[PDB]
Amino acid sequence: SMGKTLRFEIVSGVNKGYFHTNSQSESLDLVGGIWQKIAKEEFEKSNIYVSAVIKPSKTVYNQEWGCPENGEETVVLTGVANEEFVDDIEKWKDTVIKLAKELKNQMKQSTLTCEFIETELHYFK
Amino acid sequence: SMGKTLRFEIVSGVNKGYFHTNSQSESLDLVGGIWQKIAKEEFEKSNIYVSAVIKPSKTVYNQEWGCPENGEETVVLTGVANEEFVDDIEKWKDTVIKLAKELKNQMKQSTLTCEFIETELHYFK
Amino acid sequence: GKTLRFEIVSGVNKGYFHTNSQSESLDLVGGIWQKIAKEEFEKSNIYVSAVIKPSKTVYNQEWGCPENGEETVVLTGVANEEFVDDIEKWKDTVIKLAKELKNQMKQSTLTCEFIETELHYFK
Ligand SMILES: Nc1ncnc2c1ncn2[C@@H]1O[C@H](CSCC[C@H](N)C(=O)O)[C@@H](O)[C@H]1O
Ligand SMILES: Nc1ncnc2c1ncn2[C@@H]1O[C@H](CSCC[C@H](N)C(=O)O)[C@@H](O)[C@H]1O
Ligand SMILES: Nc1ncnc2c1ncn2[C@@H]1O[C@H](CSCC[C@H](N)C(=O)O)[C@@H](O)[C@H]1O
Ligand SMILES: Nc1ncnc2c1ncn2[C@@H]1O[C@H](CSCC[C@H](N)C(=O)O)[C@@H](O)[C@H]1O
Ligand SMILES: Nc1ncnc2c1ncn2[C@@H]1O[C@H](CSCC[C@H](N)C(=O)O)[C@@H](O)[C@H]1O
Ligand SMILES: Nc1ncnc2c1ncn2[C@@H]1O[C@H](CSCC[C@H](N)C(=O)O)[C@@H](O)[C@H]1O
């Protein structure tokens, strides 16, 4: 593998007071379910399924701007555009952006980051 | 040097139907111990030790393709090629690829992603 | 290729801080980062926010690694052009804080990587 592809990374808060969750495991399950829901909805329209690897985390920023002491509970979502599944990388990028905005809405987040990083994918099967 | 080098990232499932681990921390230890073993075996042959930073995760894809509701338990392994230890970036890359295939086999996975990403390493010691 | 992100891998020094779980180690590192980032922001108007993840780092038992890995924390953060006017000064700030983190966590060695990234920010 010498050609390049992309990976995305999204950082989202988990809004435990709105969703009535009380643990990292509950937040991961919630984000997993929401992502599965919206990713399937977009797959049905475009044949692009943005699968995601989601990790528990906390995000540390200024207490003045709303951060709890020691950090806000967050989830990181990351995923590669696998060339075996993705014909059109620009259409995949548009789909990730669409889903990131929808995740922001579903999670009731005020702001949200979505990054694209160049990567060289070796796929073992 | 400017520290221009590579990092790798692997995403592996944990085969609960095979290992019967009963928590996220047990899955982490299971993958960590396996990685520790195969990394040492390769180091004894090549003097390349691919150390790895491992994170708990859930991977979310279409339930039609076997994904449990809210995602499958996975582990993400990431590591840099530190020029302090690595003379030859291409041999390190070939070592990572060998270990990724070996991990896929030892974890009894049908597919496994292994990505290389360009990175600028600043090493403080 | 619009901007940069950093990633730092830190030990948690169980023998010094006496945390009992990965949740406590995460909070310990987070609180330390929150303080040094705030103090640097007052000086330079650059606030290096960080997304921190629990982890274990696996290396050779001959070099001190516990069986199945050492408990670690990964810190990662982007330079958001809406906040950051000077990417080189942000980079210098990240390095400054990473060294200060290494000191406060009583670590012997620490990695700090920079990766090119294209940031889309939704508000
Ligand atoms: N994220 C993903 N993970 C696993 N398999 C995927 C996938 N996205 C797509 N596939 C597989 O690819 C099939 C065809 S969808 C992709 C069609 C075409 N390559 C395109 O880019 O438009 C899916 O039904 C599924 O079998
Ligand atoms: N990718 C990233 N890198 C670094 N800091 C980030 C980040 N994404 C978010 N942050 C930090 O965390 C803050 C958001 S906290 C999570 C979002 C918030 N609950 C809301 O509703 O908007 C940002 O202001 C920034 O300081
Ligand atoms: N992943 C790793 N983490 C920490 N130390 C490592 C390491 N890999 C190698 N080392 C250190 O480097 C020593 C020499 S290994 C030979 C390295 C040589 N420059 C090459 O590229 O072939 C190891 O015994 C260990 O002390
Ligand atoms: N790096 C990555 N980025 C995005 N999705 C990924 C991914 N790695 C795996 N996936 C998703 O997760 C699915 C695999 S689940 C993990 C492997 C499985 N247990 C097996 O034994 O084959 C992939 O088909 C894809 O949909
Ligand atoms: N890490 C961060 N996360 C979120 N907002 C941030 C931030 N760093 C700075 N800001 C935002 O930037 C505002 C002004 S400080 C930045 C001043 C100027 N752009 C400079 O480069 O010096 C803060 O009040 C806050 O709203
Ligand atoms: N970014 C990275 N990628 C891969 N391995 C890493 C790494 N950062 C650290 N390691 C591994 O973990 C070891 C450090 S363990 C954590 C630091 C230690 N507590 C100290 O105070 O020095 C390194 O020798 C290397 O083998």
Residue A105 tokens, joined: 């809405």
- Phi and psi at residue A14, in whole multiples of 5°? -120, -5
Question: How far is C78 from A27, CA to CA, in rounded Å?
Answer: 23
Distances (CA, A) of A108 to A41, B80, C43, C121: 19, 35, 33, 15
Instruction: Tell me which residue has its CA closest to atom 13 in ligand 1.
Output: A85
> Which amino acid does the sequence have at C32?
I
What's the 3-state SS for C89-109? HHHHHHHHHHHHHHHHCCCCC
Between the CA of A113 and the centroid of ligand 2 the distance, in Å, is: 7
Residue pair A32/B58 in contact (Cβ under 8 Å)? The answer is yes
Q: Is the CB of B53 under 6 A from ligand 6?
A: yes
Residue pair A113/A13 in contact (Cβ under 8 Å)? The answer is no
- Phi and psi at residue A80, in whole multiples of 5°? -100, 155
Which residues of chain C make contact with B19, given a CB cutoff of 8 A? none
Residue pair C52/C4 in contact (Cβ under 8 Å)? The answer is no
Length of chain C: 123
Q: Is the CB of A63 under 6 A from ligand 2?
A: no
| Residue of chain A whose alpha carbon sits nearest to that of B99 | A124
Q: Do A123 and B110 touch (CB under 8 A)?
A: no
Q: Do B116 and A117 touch (CB under 8 A)?
A: no
For chain A, give every domain's residue range. 5-119
Distances (CA, A) of B101 to A33, B19, B28, B63, C59: 30, 19, 19, 26, 19
Pick among 1.10.150, 3.30.420, 3.30.870, 3.30.70: CATH of C3-117: 3.30.70
For the B4-120 domain, the top CATH level (class) is alpha beta
Q: Do B116 and A120 touch (CB under 8 A)?
A: yes
Quote the minimal CA–CA distance from B111 to chain C in Å. 23
Distances (CA, A) of A11 to A73, A81, B78, C78, C97: 11, 18, 18, 11, 21
Question: How far is A119 from B114, CA to CA, in rounded Å?
Answer: 10
Q: Is the CB of A70 under 6 A from ligand 2?
A: no
Resolution (A): 1.9
Query: Which CATH code for domain A5-119?
Result: 3.30.70
Angle of helix A89-106 versus helix A24-46 axis, rounded to 10:
130
DSSP element (H, E) containing A63: none
Residue pair C28/C52 in contact (Cβ under 8 Å)? The answer is no
Nearest CA among C12, C11, C87 for reference residue C48: C87
Interface residue of A22, A58, A98, A116 to substitute, partner C, most C CBs within 10 Å:
A58
Write down the experimental method used for this entry: X-ray
Rg (CA), chain C: 15
